[PDB]
A and B are shown apart, each in its own frame.
Chain A
Amino acid sequence: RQKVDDDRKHEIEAAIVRIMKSRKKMQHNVLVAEVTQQLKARFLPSPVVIKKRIEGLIEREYLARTPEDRKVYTYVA
């Protein structure tokens, strides 16, 4: 169970870093709909889990996703 929870973590994170590198920006909940539609026939959208995990890569260079300055995301690598 914990192994496949980690598997779902991997899935969502990879999906985000690979797709959003050429997609839009989420003022609040815009790109989460897309990342859930991409993983619709994979598993459960798990809103709480993905919301808790997208705000961890914020302080990790790639996908800065500045929480307070949620108006323009860094389109860099």
Chain B
Amino acid sequence: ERQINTEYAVSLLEQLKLFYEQQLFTDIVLIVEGTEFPCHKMVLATCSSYFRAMFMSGLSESKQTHVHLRNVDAATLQIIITYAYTGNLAMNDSTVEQLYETACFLQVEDVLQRCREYLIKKINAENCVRLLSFADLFSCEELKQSAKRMVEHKFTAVYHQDAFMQLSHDLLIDILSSDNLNVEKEETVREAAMLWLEYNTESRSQYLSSVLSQIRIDALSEVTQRAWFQGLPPNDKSVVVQGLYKSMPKFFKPRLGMTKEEMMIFIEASSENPCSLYSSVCYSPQAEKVYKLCSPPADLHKVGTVVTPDNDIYIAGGQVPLKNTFRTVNCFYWFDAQQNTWFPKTPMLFVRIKPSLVCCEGYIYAIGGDSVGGELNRRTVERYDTEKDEWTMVSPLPCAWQWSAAVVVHDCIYVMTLNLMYCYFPRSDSWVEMAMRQTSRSFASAAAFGDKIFYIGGLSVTVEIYDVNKNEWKMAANIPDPCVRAVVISNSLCVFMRETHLNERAKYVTYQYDLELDRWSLRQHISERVLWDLGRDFRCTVGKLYPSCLEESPWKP
């Protein structure tokens, strides 16, 4: 059907807006705690699913011109009316709750979906349990699930949120009884359930018993009984009887968060499947297996990795082929530790090629990486805010460097280039000159192990160790065209190198390096029966993953 809108629908909406702001042809007025809102019935019927029944049903409101609508905020109803009259919402970050409250009040489906998306995108660090209780009160399965997983991930690291105390039982039961608790130990959930019953007892003793049972035998074999003898109300006999029941039944099973194996995440591998360009796989140091990961964009490559102290994976920048009949994109992504997917985040402001992301003081710092190339000050850096979810410009780099590396030592930013090093102080937002290397090597990376930076490789086997407390560069030894990948494994400095000769196959083997010995002892030789060739542009980083969520990479020995 022909529904042309060229200069017609916009003109109609502009005429309606003009009639609204001039108070013309209005036949209904909303009374909101003394505030008047003259409007029309047609717009309220086409926008809200409640006003259509308010103006159709032949009751009292039908003839009532002065309808007194209560339990609604003035500003929220005003923004809903102006959204109905112009189509633009222009929502902030503070009044989203009351907006959704009154949007669900009038079943206004479009603004409901808009606010639902805005809330599902903005579960950053703190409003998680709050918006989870919000979605529990206003049954919203979409928001409910994302918030559920978000809490399963972060709540099991703070378990002290002020909002977490005020939760309904069913929601707490769903949270605690789930097998998605990202906890490496079983006593933290026990004490967390405990403190949730240390603020409210006596009248709430039923909930106490329920959560106690939920904790299961794994955490029921603790001080739970003694703490209860201490806080139980007097003259309670059957309560001890029902508490003694919880010890032998109800399927004691292992949890999921304990499977936080410290593994080796790789990217841009040799797609086991021929013409496929690249793939992201993983390696297990202890399990001696090779797991795979899903490509974040599935077509874009040349990305940079970073791992926060909370074991989080991020991906920024990269280039994607234009697919006309490689363009650079500043998109951003984050790896899910359980869903084996990639949820995007706030993109960058500059399209970078192979950005070097560094985490420090809870902030992500992307140093260099072909920001735009044609900058007036070619040396610049853009940092990320993991809490506010925004990018903040900081003091630019002193000199323009290419194929550089950057690490973080002692809560400070350290970027390494051919021969120079600069310490970005995040507190004073300044760059202090550091020691210069006597050797000029590029195309190499550095590792931040302890309080020493180990710049390995370059063009080789150059081992130049730097210390922060000493501020000096020294050599240790030569590792016995190697592709070096220095990294931290089990609080012990190790390396992952691959050698390649003429008419010979590649071999993967990791060595154990000692500080005072200056020697790379043979730790483990990666057999080719489990791991195949990776390539040249592959990257390495240390991080904890889950074996059950991920899938093994099928490949013939």
B427 interface residue per 8 A CB criterion: yes
Cβ contacts under 8 Å, A25 to chain B:
427-428
B425 interface residue per 8 A CB criterion: yes
In the complex the two chains form, is A24's CB within 8 Å of B432's CB? no
Could you tell me which residues of chain B, from 399 to 458, have a CB within 8 Å of some CB in chain A? 425, 427-428, 432
Q: How many A-B residue pairs have CB under 8 A?
A: 7
Cβ contacts under 8 Å, B425 to chain A:
24
**Which residue in chain A gives the minimum CB-CB distance to B412?**
A24
Cβ contacts under 8 Å, B427 to chain A:
24-25
Cβ contacts under 8 Å, A22 to chain B:
432
**Which residue in chain B gives the minimum CB-CB distance to A27?**
B427
Minimum Cβ distance to chain A for residue B424 (Å): 13
**Which residue in chain A gives the minimum CB-CB distance to B423?**
A22
Minimum Cβ distance to chain A for residue B379 (Å): 21
Could you tell me which residues of chain A, from 1 to 46, have a CB within 8 Å of some CB in chain B? 22, 24-25
Cβ contacts under 8 Å, B432 to chain A:
22
Cα A24 to Cα B423 in complex, Å, equals: 12
Cα A15 to Cα B428 in complex, Å, equals: 21
Cα A6 to Cα B77 in complex, Å, equals: 74
Cα A6 to Cα B190 in complex, Å, equals: 57
One digit per residue, 1 when the CB lies within 8 angstroms of any chain B CB and 0 when it does not, for chain A 62-77 equals 0000000000000100
Cα A22 to Cα B432 in complex, Å, equals: 8
**Which residue in chain A gives the minimum CB-CB distance to B432?**
A22
Cβ contacts under 8 Å, A24 to chain B:
425, 427-428
Cα A75 to Cα B427 in complex, Å, equals: 14
Cα A25 to Cα B428 in complex, Å, equals: 9
Cα A24 to Cα B428 in complex, Å, equals: 8
Minimum Cβ distance to chain B for residue A40 (Å): 11
Cα A7 to Cα B355 in complex, Å, equals: 51
Cα A50 to Cα B396 in complex, Å, equals: 37
Cα A22 to Cα B423 in complex, Å, equals: 11
Minimum Cβ distance to chain B for residue A51 (Å): 22
Cα A71 to Cα B425 in complex, Å, equals: 15
Minimum Cβ distance to chain B for residue A20 (Å): 12
Minimum Cβ distance to chain A for residue B267 (Å): 35
Cα A77 to Cα B319 in complex, Å, equals: 47
Minimum Cβ distance to chain B for residue A29 (Å): 16
Cβ contacts under 8 Å, A75 to chain B:
428
Could you tell me which residues of chain B, from 81 to 140, have a CB within 8 Å of some CB in chain A? none
Cα A22 to Cα B427 in complex, Å, equals: 13
**Which residue in chain A gives the minimum CB-CB distance to B433?**
A22
Cα A9 to Cα B427 in complex, Å, equals: 30
Minimum Cβ distance to chain B for residue A23 (Å): 9
**Which residue in chain B gives the minimum CB-CB distance to A34?**
B469
Cα A20 to Cα B131 in complex, Å, equals: 46
**Which residue in chain A gives the minimum CB-CB distance to B430?**
A75
Cα A25 to Cα B427 in complex, Å, equals: 9
**Which residue in chain B gives the minimum CB-CB distance to A72?**
B428
One digit per residue, 1 when the CB lies within 8 angstroms of any chain A CB and 0 when it does not, for chain B 526-549 equals 000000000000000000000000
Cα A33 to Cα B213 in complex, Å, equals: 48
Minimum Cβ distance to chain A for residue B409 (Å): 14
Cα A25 to Cα B425 in complex, Å, equals: 11
Q: List 7 A-B contacts (CB under 8 A).
A: A22-B432, A24-B425, A24-B427, A24-B428, A25-B427, A25-B428, A75-B428
Give the interface of B toward A (CB within 8 A): 425, 427-428, 432
List the 5 shortest-distance A-B pairs measured between CB atoms, nearest first.
A22-B432, A24-B427, A24-B425, A25-B427, A25-B428
